[PDB]
A and B are shown apart, each in its own frame.
Chain A
């Protein structure tokens, strides 16, 4: 195999270095994978990738001069499960029309970029479960209302950690099946509004580690199985076990919290069905278990629940 600019192997095309100033129009429409690496590429033009029905993966990474992604850039790619946008330091603008219908999207990664706002995902409408991984983008300060609806008919994993997020509006997760939400390492994030989890199913896993979040929402956590709040210092109270009905695991900051959990039982509704059969673990859905697993456990001497 071969091509003018881009190196090629097995319908996988890699356009590298500085001689690539724009996306070659002569790229085979039977391409499985496209990678743009170390290009002096100021813009990615409208409908640039439209019309590769064979295209599974798109990598755009380490482009210092890239400032914009035009409208309808990712559209008509029924076979695209993976988009990866990494290390574009001058990219501040992603056109709200860039992300079009992509029924097969599994993984959208935007990491280490200039972008000032979350990407617009309401036209993606994926049939697959989607991992949205948006990280190390310091200029992203706020999450609007309905920021994730229409990303997928299937449940969703949202990693928004290590950003500059200071602001989360009510109903930011509305119209969304949330498996998992990681907001950790947004250091300036002070408050979750009481309606964050309105019209959202889940989360089942929530990570607010290393944020200044003061308080957890009173509703929306009826499905929470796993809570990770490490070095979350001004989160002092917490909902009562009766409000976190599903919680099985918590890794927290203040040991007194863990003692609150160890001291309040829960668990009857007998339970069912069929785990029948015939230093850590592996697969087991029997509901075998134990008071919430909690840490830090107030191990080193000391009581719990105060005096």
Chain B
């Protein structure tokens, strides 16, 4: 159901410069529908969907340096299409909670 593309803000951490920069981009968030099976047959199926990217593209961005460090480039994924489906573990870290999109070690 309600899983939709929504603007978010992310944190690109520049470790050598002890700061992070914020960037708006587009990702997935919302609500999906699950059941918890009452009959536990080994041949189920037990399947649960979550809200994640159906398609994504990478974008590249200039990250300021500080005195004594060059500026650099960081490339990050951006979501084109969102849906309620399986979390794809080749590409994605499938967890309960991460540190959150805007997490920065310096603030």
Contacts and interface: CB of A to CB of B under 8 A. Distances in A.
A129 B89 contact: no
A204 B42 contact: yes
A285 B42 CA distance: 13
A167 B70 CA distance: 47
Interface in A111-134: 112, 129
A87 B43 CA distance: 30
Given A38-B99, A62-B99, A135 B43 contact: no
B96 interface: yes
B96 A180 contact: no
A162 interface: yes
Contacts of A285: 41
A226 B96 contact: no
B68 interface: no
A205 B99 contact: no
A104 to B, nearest CB: 16
Interface string B64-99: 000000000000000000000000010001011001
B43 A61 contact: no
A283 B95 CA distance: 29
A86 B95 CA distance: 9
B62 interface: no
Contacts of A84: 96
Contact of B89 (A37, A136, A157, A180): A136
A180 B42 contact: yes
Chain B interface secondary structure, helix, strand, loop or mixed?
loop
A62 B43 CA distance: 34
Interface residues of B, number: 10
A225 B44 CA distance: 11
Contacts of B39: 283
A135 B92 CA distance: 13
Contacts of B40: 129
B42 A162 contact: no
Interface in A170-218: 179-180, 202, 204-205
Residue of B40, B42, B99 with highest tally of chain A CB at under 10 A: B42
A106 to B, nearest CB: 12
A136 B94 CA distance: 11
Interface string B11-42: 00000000000000000000000000001111
Interface in A255-307: 283, 285
A179 B42 CA distance: 5
Interface string B40-59: 11110000000000000000
Contacts of A22: none
Nearest to B42: A179
Contact of B42 (A87, A205, A248): A205
Interface in A17-70: 37-38, 59, 61-62
8 contacts: A38-B99, A129-B40, A204-B42, A204-B43, A225-B42, A225-B43, A248-B43, A283-B39
Given A202-B42, A204-B42, A285-B41, 8 more contacts: A38-B99, A59-B96, A62-B99, A84-B96, A87-B93, A129-B40, A155-B42, A204-B43
